[PDB]
């Protein structure tokens, strides 16, 4: 076989759920850790795209990391494709039967969901990459990002 094996890793991060309200995304960032450095071995916080941008910016400009490979920022969530397509669909409502339109409305909702899912992955991959870096996983701004249980913006 050919296989990548992880045994009792000390830091695991994922985004198990997320919420879109008028195309504004809130990510649940859930962490599991066996490390002393964290207040708790398991916890979740709520993060927005700008929080991730904040974290990436502040790592990039950390003098000590200038020789390190910092994983790329996740891209800003963008629902313009699905939204514009749904608008076009609505304009064409008269040319179409009730059940044709229903079926297509459902298909475009699925298109929106696939965009959502993709931006989730992008944000999650970034955190997982940071958790795997021997130096960056220890960064205190990263820790603040994972655990500060209030609005990181303010």
Interface positions with Cl ion (CB under 5 A)? 24-25, 49, 77
At residue 87's C-alpha, the angle toward residues 85 and 91, to 5°, is 115
Buried b (16+ CB within 10 A) or exposed e, 103-134: ebeeebeeebeebbeebbebbbebbebbbebe
In this complex, which beta carbon is closest to Cl ion, that of residue 48 or of residue 62? 48
In this complex, which beta carbon is closest to Cl ion, that of residue 11 or of residue 25? 25
The answer to whether the Cα torsion of 84, 90, 93, 99 is positive or negative is positive
Min dist. Cβ of residue 138 to Cl ion (A): 28
Min dist. Cβ of residue 50 to Cl ion (A): 8
In this complex, which beta carbon is closest to Cl ion, that of residue 47 or of residue 136? 47
- Residue number closest to Cl ion, CB atom: 25
Question: Is residue 79 annotated as involved in ligand binding?
Answer: yes
> Residues annotated as binding site?
20-26, 79-85, 93-96
């Amino acid at each position: 076989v050919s296989v990548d094996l992880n045994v009792d890793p000390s830091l695991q991060i994922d985004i198990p759920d997320a919420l879109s309200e008028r195309d504004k995304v809130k990510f649940t960032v859930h962490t599991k850790t066996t490390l002393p450095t964290f207040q708790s071995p398991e916890f979740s916080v709520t993060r927005q795209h700008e929080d991730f941008v904040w974290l990436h910016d502040t790592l990039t400009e950390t003098t000590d990391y200038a020789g390190l490979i910092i994983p790329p920022a996740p891209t800003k969530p963008d629902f313009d494709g699905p939204r514009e397509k749904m608008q076009k669909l609505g304009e064409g409502e008269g040319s179409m039967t009730k059940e044709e339109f229903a079926k297509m409305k459902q298909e475009l909702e699925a298109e929106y969901l696939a965009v959502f899912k993709k931006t989730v992955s992008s944000h999650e991959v970034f955190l997982q990459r940071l958790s795997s870096h021997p130096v960056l996983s220890k960064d205190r701004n990263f820790h603040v990002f994972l655990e500060y249980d209030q609005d990181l913006s303010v």
